[PDB]
Amino acid sequence: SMNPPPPETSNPNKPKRQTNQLQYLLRVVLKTLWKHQFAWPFQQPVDAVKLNLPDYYKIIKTPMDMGTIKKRLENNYYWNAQECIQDFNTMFTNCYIYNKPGDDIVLMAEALEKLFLQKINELPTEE
Ligand SMILES: CCc1cnn2c(NCc3ccc[n+](O)c3)cc(N3CCCC[C@H]3CCO)nc12
Ligand SMILES: CCc1cnn2c(NCc3ccc[n+](O)c3)cc(N3CCCC[C@H]3CCO)nc12
Q: Where are the domains of the chain?
A: 19-123
- Report the candidate in 100, 11, 98, 89 with the shortest Cα–Cα distance to residue 61: 98
Q: Beta-carbon neighbour count of residue 54 at 10 Å?
A: 10
Name the residue at shortest CA distance from atom 2 of ligand 2.
Answer: 41
| Cα(75) to centroid(ligand 2), Å | 28
At the second CATH level, the architecture of 19-123 is Up-down Bundle (1.20)
Which ligand ends up closest to the CA of 50? Answer: 1
Q: Is the CB of 1 under 6 A from ligand 1?
A: no
What is d(CA 38, CA 35) in angstroms, rounded to the nearest whole number?
8
- CA–CA distance, 9 with 40 (Å, rounded to integer): 20
User: Which atom, in ligand 2's list, is nearest to the CA of 91?
Assistant: 1
Experimentally, how was this structure solved? X-ray
